Design a binder for this molecule. Structure first.
Ligand SMILES: [Ca+2]
Length: 153
């Protein structure tokens, strides 16, 4: 699809932290995500990007596309080690998270798994996409910072 291509082609969103290809997030929430994630990058040198896409036409699921994106945007470990990518497919209510080793170690599998099985699908199913993405960001940031887990919705 044009969406799947554009997301891969355009490269990582350096000034914004979010590629909202599905058009489901507001200007306010994208600004709030920029505030939260540019602060995480400043403090911890981890860059977390979020991508929304309405549906995947290649028969790839969300994790396969997230990994494809990580490898295309950051083609070496020097470039990808500290990077994380969260993908939300809005028609399917499915999310996935991947990233370089330093990012994955910082979050931990428990919170990676919890965010994709709780915040993302539950909130998107109720069409609360801004909350889905912002609550998932806050939860991943809390894990990276060793703060108490805010939990799922
Ligand atoms: Ca889309």
């Amino acid at each position: 699809s044009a969406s799947e291509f554009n997301i891969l082609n355009d490269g990582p969103p350096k000034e914004t932290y979010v590629v909202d290809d599905a058009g489901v997030l507001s200007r306010v929430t994208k600004s709030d995500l920029k505030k939260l994630l540019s602060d995480l990058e400043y403090r911890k040198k981890l860059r977390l990007n979020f991508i929304t896409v309405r549906k995947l036409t290649s028969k790839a699921d969300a994790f396969e596309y997230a990994d494809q994106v990580l490898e295309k945007w950051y083609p070496s470990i020097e470039e990808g080690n500290n990077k994380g990518i969260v993908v939300l497919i809005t028609s399917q209510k499915e999310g996935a998270i991947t990233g370089g080793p330093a990012f994955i170690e910082a979050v931990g599998e428990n919170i990676l798994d919890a965010t994709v099985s709780e915040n993302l699908p539950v909130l998107a199913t109720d069409e609360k996409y801004n909350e889905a993405v912002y609550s998932s960001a806050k939860r991943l940031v809390a894990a990276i910072d060793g703060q108490p887990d805010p939990g799922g919705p």
